Design a protein around this ligand. Structure first.
Ligand SMILES: CC(=O)Nc1ccc(Br)cc1
Ligand SMILES: CC(=O)Nc1ccc(Br)cc1
Ligand SMILES: CC(=O)Nc1ccc(Br)cc1
Lengths: 261, 302
């Protein structure tokens, strides 16, 4: 059980719940962004999903990166021509923090198709560090999902992978997922995965851990359910493509439920 | 980032490292004595080093009397200065130069108890230290000891996933790492502390191996070669080999002879093979060995 830190999991959960609030982006930042839109971000995140796949980075890394991006765009106004540079620097920081073997700076320069220089990536990397004040150990959707998974009886890989996928889909669209905390989307994701695969619901035991019920998850779950329903039609497709892979049990090929009941 | 280098006066060099030099400095406005770690960015063709990113980010979050305080981070030209709470010595230098005839049981007990407090705070905030050793434990003039050097540190998730293998200075490295375990956890830090506990008693390293296999065997020769009974899984582990010599477990009272029954009990639980049975820092705080510690808790620092 030590891999599941029995002596510290509650402490850790409590602490992540407080830091998700601290590390939260501004809900309505994109309105105050003069030259960029929810759609441009979606394109950006979708691409980072691909970079993630191109260099076999952790899903955690993707999640951190997006947190860094949204927190940056929450206080820094950015021209469309520079949005990808922010994305690149973010992915570089998330890689250095989370990855055993981060890609070299020059690989980041390479995937931006030489839009930018090594110097630009490096200077941006610092700017982001400055804007975030090195505040990089951010709770992610994934950090909550993995703890919620410990409550499955029994464990189910299709459930795990499907919840991860739904979690990822949420990264794509700031409207409406910026309004929800990681811990809540994770919950929505877990319940929807669970229900799709097994027909079961959000367990009592996670009601005890989290304080959340289907009541409190309902808004988020309604959105996540729409997103899941429409995922084949969304302009951004890299997450669906990724989750056809056997590594994730091909869960993007499962059929969403027509109702949550 | 309230500070600038204009307000500091360098006093002397106190240390060196992979990414730079540490100085003892003085805040000319407040009087505060600090340790400045300079990280050079000019030389770096890979921008800010991953070591520094973790050290800074994880230390921001860890406010605890037994963890060395990061006061500030100054980002200048191609240079990064970490400003730290200053502590005059490390535990290794203390053991070497002043504990000639020994460290008094009161002080060992006090130090071990503070280390467990700080480590428990680390684990409680999902940080593994992953390089606990006496060189990385700082002592002040007031009796406080504090975990330091978070350059090898890592924010973990629950459950943990595969992290960097071959972490921890060898002498302090837990068996599960030496056996190429897929996963490791808070238990590796405990193992380190247990090595350290023994070392504070004897003032010599418990397992001074000169390779990963010599290290493994020195451990096996001391606690016996583990089998499925003492450690379920051990024989399935990636670098476990059936041909490993099978050493009898020597009586634990022979491992650290001067150690009392309470001491031996605690130590044995810190050095359990199976990381699942190894005591946590949190559980360890309530061990009888600490019944008679009264050294008052160090203050937080701001
Ligand atoms: C979509 C558009 O108008 N322009 C654009 C430019 C860069 C990114 Br990254 C995303 C979008
Ligand atoms: C060893 C010593 O003199 N003092 C000290 C204090 C803090 C750090 Br970080 C490194 C060294
Ligand atoms: C690995 C190495 O250097 N030496 C060694 C010695 C004995 C065994 Br059994 C396995 C390895």
């Amino acid at each position: 059980g030590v891999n599941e830190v029995p002596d510290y999991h509650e402490d850790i959960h409590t602490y992540l719940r407080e830091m998700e609030v601290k590390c939260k982006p501004k809900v309505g930042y994109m309105k105050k962004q003069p030259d960029i839109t929810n759609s441009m971000r979606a394109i950006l995140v979708d691409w980072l999903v691909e970079v993630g796949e191109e260099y076999k980075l952790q899903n955690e890394t993707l999640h951190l990166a997006v947190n860094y991006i949204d927190r940056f765009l929450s206080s820094m106004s950015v021209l469309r021509g520079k949005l990808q540079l922010v994305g690149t620097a973010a992915m570089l920081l998330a890689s250095k923090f989370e990855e055993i073997y981060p890609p070299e700076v020059a690989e980041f320069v390479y995937i931006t198709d030489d839009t930018y220089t090594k110097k630009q990536v490096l200077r941006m990397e610092h700017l982001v560090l400055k804007v975030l004040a090195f505040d990089l150990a951010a709770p992610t959707i994934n950090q909550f999902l993995t703890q919620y998974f410990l409550h499955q009886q029994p464990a189910n890989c299709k459930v795990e992978s499907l919840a991860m996928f739904l979690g990822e889909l949420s990264l794509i669209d700031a409207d409406p997922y910026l309004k929800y905390l990681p811990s809540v989307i994770a919950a929505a994701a877990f319940h929807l995965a669970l229900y799709t695969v097994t027909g079961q619901s959000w367990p009592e035991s996670l009601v005890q851990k989290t304080g959340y019920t289907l009541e409190t998850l309902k808004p988020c779950l309604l959105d996540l359910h729409q997103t899941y329903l429409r995922a084949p039609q969304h302009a951004q497709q890299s997450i669906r493509e990724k989750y056809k892979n056997s590594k994730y049990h091909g869960v993007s090929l499962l059929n969403p439920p027509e109702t949550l009941n | 980032g309230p500070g600038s280098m204009e307000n500091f006066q360098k006093v002397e060099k106190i240390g060196e490292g992979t990414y730079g030099v540490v100085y003892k400095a003085r805040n000319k406005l407040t009087g505060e004595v600090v340790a400045l770690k300079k990280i050079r960015l000019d030389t770096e063709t890979e921008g800010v080093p991953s070591t520094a990113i973790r050290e800074i980010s994880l230390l921001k979050e860890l406010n605890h009397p037994n963890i060395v305080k990061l006061l500030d981070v100054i980002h200048t030209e191609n240079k990064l200065y970490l400003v730290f709470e200053f502590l005059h010595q490390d535990l290794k230098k203390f053991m070497d130069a002043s504990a000639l005839t020994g460290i008094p049981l009161p002080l060992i007990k006090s130090y071990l108890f503070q280390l467990l407090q700080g480590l428990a705070f680390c684990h409680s905030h999902r940080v593994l230290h992953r390089d606990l050793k006496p060189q990385n434990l700082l002592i002040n003039t007031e009796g406080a000891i504090k975990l330091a050097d978070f350059g090898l540190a890592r924010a973990f998730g629950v459950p943990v996933r595969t992290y960097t293998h071959e972490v921890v200075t060898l002498w302090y490295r837990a068996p599960e790492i030496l056996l190429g375990c897929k996963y490791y956890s808070t238990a590796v830090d405990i193992w380190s502390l247990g090595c350290i506990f023994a070392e504070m008693v004897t003032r010599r390293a418990l397992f001074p191996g000169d390779s990963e296999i010599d290290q493994l065997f020195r451990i096996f020769r001391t606690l016996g070669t583990p089998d499925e009974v003492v450690w379920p899984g051990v024989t399935s582990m990636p670098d476990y080999k059936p041909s490993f010599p099978k050493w009898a477990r020597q009586d634990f009272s022979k491992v650290v002879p001067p150690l009392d029954e309470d001491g031996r009990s605690l130590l044995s639980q810190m050095l359990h093979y199976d990381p699942n049975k190894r005591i946590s820092a949190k559980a360890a705080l309530a061990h009888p060995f600490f019944q008679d510690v009264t050294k008052p808790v160090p203050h937080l620092r701001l």
